[PDB]
Design an enzyme around this catalytic site. Structure first.
Site, PDB file in Angstrom:
ATOM      1  N   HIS A 197      15.518  -0.394   0.133  1.00 39.58           N
ATOM      2  CA  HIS A 197      14.509  -1.279   0.711  1.00 39.58           C
ATOM      3  C   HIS A 197      13.509  -1.764  -0.326  1.00 39.58           C
ATOM      4  O   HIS A 197      12.692  -2.615   0.016  1.00 39.58           O
ATOM      5  CB  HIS A 197      13.826  -0.723   1.967  1.00 39.58           C
ATOM      6  CG  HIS A 197      12.896   0.421   1.735  1.00 39.58           C
ATOM      7  ND1 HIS A 197      13.230   1.713   2.127  1.00 39.58           N
ATOM      8  CD2 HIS A 197      11.647   0.431   1.207  1.00 39.58           C
ATOM      9  CE1 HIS A 197      12.181   2.468   1.802  1.00 39.58           C
ATOM     10  NE2 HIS A 197      11.196   1.739   1.271  1.00 39.58           N
ATOM     11  N   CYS A 232       7.924   6.137  -1.128  1.00 44.81           N
ATOM     12  CA  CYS A 232       9.390   6.026  -1.033  1.00 44.81           C
ATOM     13  C   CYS A 232      10.059   6.182  -2.374  1.00 44.81           C
ATOM     14  O   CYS A 232       9.484   5.787  -3.394  1.00 44.81           O
ATOM     15  CB  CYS A 232       9.810   4.750  -0.316  1.00 44.81           C
ATOM     16  SG  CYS A 232       9.015   4.577   1.295  1.00 44.81           S
ATOM     17  N   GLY A 271       4.202   3.615  -0.583  1.00 48.17           N
ATOM     18  CA  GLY A 271       4.399   3.714  -2.023  1.00 48.17           C
ATOM     19  C   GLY A 271       5.083   5.013  -2.436  1.00 48.17           C
ATOM     20  O   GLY A 271       5.551   5.122  -3.570  1.00 48.17           O
TER      21      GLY A 271
HETATM   22  C1  LIG Z   1       6.113   2.108   4.185  1.00 45.13           C
HETATM   23  C2  LIG Z   1       6.755   3.157   4.684  1.00 45.13           C
HETATM   24  C3  LIG Z   1       8.036   2.986   5.407  1.00 45.13           C
HETATM   25  O1  LIG Z   1       8.328   3.690   6.366  1.00 45.13           O
HETATM   26  N1  LIG Z   1       8.839   2.012   4.953  1.00 45.13           N
HETATM   27  C4  LIG Z   1      10.018   1.568   5.584  1.00 45.13           C
HETATM   28  C5  LIG Z   1       9.952   1.265   6.939  1.00 45.13           C
HETATM   29  C6  LIG Z   1      11.118   1.109   7.669  1.00 45.13           C
HETATM   30  C7  LIG Z   1      12.341   1.238   7.059  1.00 45.13           C
HETATM   31  C8  LIG Z   1      12.411   1.491   5.705  1.00 45.13           C
HETATM   32  C9  LIG Z   1      11.254   1.644   4.961  1.00 45.13           C
HETATM   33  C10 LIG Z   1       6.202   4.534   4.590  1.00 45.13           C
HETATM   34  C11 LIG Z   1       4.875   4.793   4.900  1.00 45.13           C
HETATM   35  C12 LIG Z   1       4.399   6.087   4.853  1.00 45.13           C
HETATM   36  C13 LIG Z   1       5.272   7.092   4.491  1.00 45.13           C
HETATM   37  N2  LIG Z   1       6.555   6.876   4.178  1.00 45.13           N
HETATM   38  C14 LIG Z   1       6.998   5.617   4.230  1.00 45.13           C
END
Ligand SMILES: C=C(C(=O)Nc1ccccc1)c1cccnc1
Ligand SMILES: C=C(C(=O)Nc1ccccc1)c1cccnc1
Lengths: 304, 304
Positions: free
Chosen positions: B41, B145, B143
């Site tokens: 992603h 990920c 951030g």
């Molecule tokens: C931005 C995030 C996230 O979930 N991204 C995402 C959302 C949907 C599918 C793939 C990626 C996030 C925030 C806090 C902790 N971890 C991740």
């Protein structure tokens, strides 16, 4: 989101760990520049530990008696000296992995990461607080002495603790990196009173703010309190009295959440007087006091 | 003695963290040998995340669109490919800090350390369990990920998790290092059911054994139970059914303490049915399930 008992990345400290052997005793040492720091009790036998005369025991030792091994490589010891309860072994080689570092004496109620080590090898890392009574509740077995506690501010490692002893009560005692014990402790196998401990009020409030930021809000109520009223309850429940200095340090969390510090104190008052009623806050069934306000901000902002 | 939620030393993993940017998106990558692994992603914009066609989005990207920076130094990308939900960016330089490593797919109920990172920089390390429902309860902000989970067996790092997503419920989802999600999750901003979760019975028993080894014994009773009877109670309280395989894995702890596994099950049965009555076990007011039997043995023996 999510809130965890997070330790600092231990890499910078792993690069400083060495094994120190003197006679029959092996423990850990911290190699920074051309000096290896370790607990002075590395010079004791079990016969000595009941009442050691460290000055006399050290006089029987020469540089060549201190065996220092950095993983696989042997360090050459060209000097030795005792400063308080630590030995400083001067070696002929500066540690190539020495990070930017400082030696700091932390205050009770502050937190730090510990890199538990055995035979100069890192085994694990955990976060803990220095109790108000100057003990730490760690995870240390025989051979872990010399393992260190630290904090990291970007690229600077502030070393604050070196492990020395487990009291008969199973709690831990150690020194700053100049060898001064935290608390009343002495490096002798004798029963030693750790004072009455208290709960770190400012940290419990910081953690309640972390709970609100991370969606756990059931404990918020319609009440407020004063420092005076709150401190009557803190007294009853063995919590540290809250001061304006603690309120000020909680300012960033109060500003971020919009919940006035005294309003959070009223939630804490009700939790102390009523308990959790079988509920949890951030996965805990008790009031957590091992996160400072700085830790909560750091974890909730993503500081690297 | 003492028992803490201990993470592995993170040094070997810190040396592998890099920042990966594609277009407007920045996240973390894992650099092992001449390949950088990261969540696919990284190629999405916020417009795309509601239902991304990853194959089409990746076709618009060339090697030079993936900016990989190892702290201060820029890596040259000579290939890219998508494997499941991860991207593999071939770089022209092997990571000089690549440790001995393996990619493993862990089982639900197993534990691992996470090195939370932002912009390729390590921020903290914590231990956690893969829930029976294949989610993790982590501490991750936007951030983070690309941050990874791992275990270490002497000098070998077994990477088991790469962070991808936070579900609307605030729990976390990710993949093994071949890009396969743990659980039913897909990398799309859509509401997604995480199944019914259960408590990891074998880990709670392991932790009760750790409590006995470390002096907390108040919960030991005069009773015993059978697997059948215990499992009727496990069912009522949403605990995983205990099997002979779990009893066998608890063998070392049962041998060390002399407390038969079914006798410890009877203590667990009484704790489930009666609660703690305002008491604590190893500083916790709830039954802890984030330590495996291997973790308890490792921590109680001092493995480096
Ligand atoms: C931005 C995030 C996230 O979930 N991204 C995402 C959302 C949907 C599918 C793939 C990626 C996030 C925030 C806090 C902790 N971890 C991740
Ligand atoms: C052997 C230990 C110890 O307490 N030594 C010591 C005893 C008295 C004075 C100085 C050193 C130990 C065991 C477990 C955890 N940490 C330390």
């Amino acid at each position: 989101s999510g809130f965890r008992k997070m330790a600092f990345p231990s890499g910078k400290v792993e690069g400083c760990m060495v094994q120190v052997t003197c006679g029959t005793t092996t423990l850990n040492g911290l190699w920074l520049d051309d000096v290896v720091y370790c607990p002075r009790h590395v010079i004791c036998t079990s016969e000595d530990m009941l009442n050691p005369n460290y000055e006399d025991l050290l006089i029987r030792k020469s540089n060549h008696n201190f065996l220092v091994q950095a993983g696989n490589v042997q360090l050459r010891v060209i000097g030795h000296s005792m400063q308080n309860c630590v030995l400083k072994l001067k070696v002929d080689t500066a540690n190539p992995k020495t990070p930017k570092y400082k030696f700091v004496r932390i205050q009770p109620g502050q937190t730090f990461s510990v890199l538990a080590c055995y035979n100069g090898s890192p085994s694990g890392v955990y976060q803990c607080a220095m109790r108000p009574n100057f003990t730490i509740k760690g995870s240390f077995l025989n051979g872990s002495c010399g393992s260190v506690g630290f904090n990291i501010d970007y690229d600077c490692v502030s070393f604050c603790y070196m492990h020395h002893m487990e009291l008969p009560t199973g709690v831990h005692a150690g020194t700053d990196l100049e060898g001064n014990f935290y608390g009343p402790f002495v490096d002798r196998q004798t029963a030693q009173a750790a004072g009455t401990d208290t709960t770190i009020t400012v940290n419990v409030l910081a953690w309640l703010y972390a709970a609100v930021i991370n969606g756990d809000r059931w404990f918020l109520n319609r009440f407020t309190t004063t420092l005076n009223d709150f401190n009557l309850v803190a007294m009853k429940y063995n919590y540290e009295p809250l001061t304006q200095d603690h309120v000020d340090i909680l300012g960033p969390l109060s500003a971020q959440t919009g919940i006035a510090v005294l309003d959070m104190c009223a939630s804490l008052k009700e939790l102390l007087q009523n308990g959790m009623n079988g509920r949890t806050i951030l996965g805990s069934a008790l009031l957590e006091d091992e996160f400072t306000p700085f830790d909560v901000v750091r974890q909730c902002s993503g500081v690297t």
